[PDB]
Amino acid sequence: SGPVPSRARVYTDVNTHRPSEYWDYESHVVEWGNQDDYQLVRKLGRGKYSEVFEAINITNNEKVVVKILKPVAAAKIKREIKILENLRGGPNIITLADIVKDPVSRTPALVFEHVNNTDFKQLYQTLTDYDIRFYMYEILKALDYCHSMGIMHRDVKPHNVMIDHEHRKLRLIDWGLAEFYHPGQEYNVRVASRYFKGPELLVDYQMYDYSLDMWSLGCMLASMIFRKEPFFHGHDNYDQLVRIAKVLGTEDLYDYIDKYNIELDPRFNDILGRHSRKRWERFVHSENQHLVSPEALDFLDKLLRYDHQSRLTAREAMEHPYFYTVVK
Numbered sequence: 028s029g030p031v032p033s034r035a036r037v038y039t040d041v042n043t044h045r046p047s048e049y050w051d052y053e054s055h056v057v058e059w060g061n062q063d064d065y066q067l068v069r070k071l072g073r074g075k076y077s078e079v080f081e082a083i084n085i086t087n088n089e090k091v092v093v094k095i096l097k098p099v100a101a102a103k104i105k106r107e108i109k110i111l112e113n114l115r116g117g118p119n120i121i122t123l124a125d126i127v128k129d130p131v132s133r134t135p136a137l138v139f140e141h142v143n144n145t146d147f148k149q150l151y152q153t154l155t156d157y158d159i160r161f162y163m164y165e166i167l168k169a170l171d172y173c174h175s176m177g178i179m180h181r182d183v184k185p186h187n188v189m190i191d192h193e194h195r196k197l198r199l200i201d202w203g204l205a206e207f208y209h210p211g212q213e214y215n216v217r218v219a220s221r222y223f224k225g226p227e228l229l230v231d232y233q234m235y236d237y238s239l240d241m242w243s244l245g246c247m248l249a250s251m252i253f254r255k256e257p258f259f260h261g262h263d264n265y266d267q268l269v270r271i272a273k274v275l276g277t278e279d280l281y282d283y284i285d286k287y288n289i290e291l292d293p294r295f296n297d298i299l300g301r302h303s304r305k306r307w308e309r310f311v312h313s314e315n316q317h318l319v320s321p322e323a324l325d326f327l328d329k330l331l332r333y334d335h336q337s338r339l340t341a342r343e344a345m346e347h348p349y350f351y352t353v354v355k
């Protein structure tokens with residue numbers, strides 16, 4: 028009885044054929060740099076987990092970004108550091124330049140390469156059909172890379188993707204929620220922002236994998252091409268599932284939970300209803316027609332699936348006709 032187990036269909040074995048030192052983040056010894064090499068210039072902002080500053084590395088006069096971590100479990104801090112070090116040099120992965128102890132917070136401060144990012148609210152309004160495909164391809168390079176390195180990002184969304192549009196430079200940042208994929212491991216479902224949450228998280232299916240990032244990628248794509256921000260606009264985690272079911276339909280949702288022997292929360296009884304799966308051309312109108320194409324719709328169809336096992340992997344997504352027009 029209970030949930031039917033699941034494994035990723037790709038990169039299942041990456042972490043077992045690597046030394047324990049690679050994925051065992053708890054045993055990692057942090058090599059501390061010197062906080063005096065960095066001078067804070069301006070606060071970019073503060074979120075739930077960190078305060079971020081633009082800074083200058085006074086040893087080479089280069090612009091950097093300093094992420095001062097708020098106190099959390101020491102395990103969560105070493106996980107971020109180990110993943111960043113393991114992924115360093117990878118295509119479109121942010122470079123971790125240093126780790127210092129901030130004198131004021133008494134917490135680790137991660138120093139990154141600076142990316143001159145255009146805010147989401149501005150790029151969202153100007154990206155062309157061509158630019159969207161180009162940037163989606165750059166994201167897929169980062170995701171196939173971290174997945175092939177046995178890591179799932181788990182927080183893919185626009186504010187975690189830096190774009191320097193003038194230089195067509197993209198970097199996938201914020202590896203604070205990222206984890207090592209271990210076949211059969213039960214993970215915490217309290218990851219990602221509500222609108223980006225995969226069905227596996229919303230139905231409390233813990234044995235998820237890299238394919239969670241493909242759902243989030245699909246949510247970003249739908250919002251962009253259809254001009255509907257966010258695409259699945261739930262008022263809460265339960266309504267989030269209802270919003271998805273109104274597009275993907277209730278019959279495939281029941282096939283998904285029956286395949287994995289998942290039981291819906293009984294509060295879905297008063298709110299879920301019965302919904303047909305909708306054709307993607309329904310979301311097309313005269314204000315988004317220039318961002319949509321049969322290739323974009325077919326690609327979206329293959330990412331936004333309830334069954335995490337049925338979604339395109341990052342490598343398959345890169346082979347899709349949607350990217351044929353992108354100069355490679």
Ligand SMILES: Nc1ncnc2c1ncn2[C@@H]1O[C@H](COP(=O)(O)OP(=O)(O)O)[C@@H](O)[C@H]1O
Nearest residue numbers: 074076077079092139140141142186200201203
């Ligand atoms: N390398 C960077 N270049 C430019 N801006 C950055 C960089 N790293 C972070 N930022 C900015 O700071 C914000 C917070 O960074 P992030 O790593 O996502 O922290 P958190 O885990 O607290 O969300 C980002 O959304 C972005 O606006």
Ligand SMILES: NCc1ccc(-c2ccccc2O)c(Cl)c1
Nearest residue numbers: 077078095096097098131132134
């Ligand atoms: N201005 C530098 C700084 C000082 C204190 C904290 C801090 C430290 C502990 C708890 C919460 C916090 O905001 C942080 Cl993250 C940064």
Ligand SMILES: NCc1ccc(-c2ccccc2O)c(Cl)c1
Nearest residue numbers: 147150151162185188190247251
């Ligand atoms: N933080 C800047 C940013 C990152 C990704 C995208 C993006 C790019 C391609 C497709 C969907 C997207 O949301 C945009 Cl519009 C802006």
Ligand SMILES: [Mg+2]
Nearest residue numbers: 186187200201
């Ligand atoms: Mg972030």
Ligand SMILES: [Mg+2]
Nearest residue numbers: 076201203204
């Ligand atoms: Mg984060």
